[PDB]
Design a protein around this ligand. Structure first.
Ligand SMILES: [Cl-]
Ligand SMILES: [Mg+2]
Lengths: 172, 167
């Protein structure tokens, strides 16, 4: 069985960046630059930021293009002060032959199926509110405070009395 | 195939929903939920919504109660944070009952890039001086007519330059 589909790109330029609510606004600004410059962000294991030029779409000006992007990048991080201090950004750029393409793996995660899953995920509307059916109310009433919402729609199921979960009771 | 599952006579389930980067905000939020799930000893269930189970895989007689405590902390954590515009419209549902639950393995595909240029660009950033763009000779040679670059020094073996700007 084959798990890689990849090609040699003889001509390619690679960029890594890193810092040594604000950070997300910055990375959002970088994300916007990638798209503006027509480049490719690569998802990497870590906190580092990887951008690639000349791949998957070759271009003869791959190094210059990545260079312009990197300059705009540092420019963006310069303008954005945080504590009021500038962002300590490292940027590295290299150029040379690479291999690139798609790799097959498997994602493992927990899942659940049953009426309870449906009921929990298909109750209509509310905000900041926690809504629960009778079977949950009966289990929580002695140690928590709830107030009846009333009869609502659970899509795929029907109409259902529900309660808003307000808070815990202080132990008596 | 691709599922290992078991019948659970009783379990409690939580579903939370929220109705361009912002992508990163919702990720940071789900990252805070993730930390909470671990704090409470619960399990996450896996696009624009978040699900949690209690009683799976580890049995506990207080599964609904533990989910409820988690859920109140969930709403409080969301209430603190705010998106970069508005408060976060978080709606939560809980239920309890018999379920089937376990691990799903789903084929995932990644677009990756390997080779010396990757290794070298990584070295260039890690050893970078803060505020600068560091590049080796091979980059220097391709940029030198159009960009200004000042030599920094040699790194362990290899010369590097600082990219300053266009001419
Ligand atoms: Cl070039
Ligand atoms: Mg199981």
């Amino acid at each position: 069985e084959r798990n890689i589909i990849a090609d040699k790109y003889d001509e390619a330029s690679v960029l890594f960046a890193d810092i040594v609510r604000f950070l997300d606004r910055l990375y959002s600004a970088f994300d916007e630059l990638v798209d503006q410059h027509g480049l490719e962000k690569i998802k990497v294991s870590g906190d580092s930021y990887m951008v690639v030029s000349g791949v998957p779409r070759p271009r003869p000006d791959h190094t210059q293009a990545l260079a312009d992007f990197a300059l705009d990048m540092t420019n963006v991080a310069a303008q954005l002060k945080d504590r009021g201090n500038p962002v300590p950004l490292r940027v590295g750029l290299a150029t040379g032959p690479v291999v690139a393409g798609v790799v097959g793996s498997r994602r493992f995660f927990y899942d659940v199926w049953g009426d309870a899953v449906n009921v929990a995920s298909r109750m209509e509307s509310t905000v900041g509110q926690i809504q629960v059916p009778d079977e949950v109310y009966e289990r929580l009433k002695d140690d928590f405070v709830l107030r009846e919402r009333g009869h609502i729609n659970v899509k795929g199921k029907g109409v259902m009395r529900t309660w808003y979960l307000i808070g815990r009771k202080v132990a008596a």
